């Protein structure tokens, strides 16, 4: 039940300088998450301390409405590339 959140990363394999590693204080899964259908696949994590916001670290707005089909989006991660 243990998660360290790493902010300000680009190269996850090298400590670059800009990173803030903050442990999760509270982990809250959606009450209706269904592991079979994967319906409600969403979870909130409370950081043990606030992140410091700066050049390398910034929040992203929640949607003001749902998006039209055909909207271009940007998806990012360190997941498998093959």
């Amino acid at each position: 039940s243990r998660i360290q959140v790493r902010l300000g990363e680009h190269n996850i394999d090298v400590l670059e300088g800009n990173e803030q590693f903050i442990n999760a204080a509270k982990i809250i899964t959606h009450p209706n998450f269904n592991g079979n259908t994967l319906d409600n696949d969403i979870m909130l994590i409370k950081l043990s301390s606030p992140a410091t916001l700066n050049s390398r670290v910034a929040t992203v707005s929640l949607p003001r409405s749902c998006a039209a089909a055909g909207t271009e989006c940007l998806i990012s991660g360190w997941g498998n590339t093959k």
């Binding site: 090298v14 994967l38 319906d39 979870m43 949607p63 989006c73 940007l74």
Partner: protein
Amino acid sequence: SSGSSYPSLLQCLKAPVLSNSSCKSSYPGQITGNMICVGFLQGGKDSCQGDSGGPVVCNGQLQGIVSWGYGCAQKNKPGVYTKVCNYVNWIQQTIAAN
């Protein structure tokens, strides 16, 4: 499409929100109202294992969370993503309480 390679450097991908139809055709009976498809039916470009949880940002707004799929980057098997726009109330309420 095949094998395993997990990067050191963060990866990015531009991809369009697919219409409900093209999303539901792809996964008959499996797409709920809390889900949207984003990606390409030709395959080749997709999120994959290790991307889960991450952002799908469109016009400066977090519209999706990397959720699931049938493998990654397969023809007619686009990524499926948690529709964040259904959850703003839950998110706010939870943040207020906690």
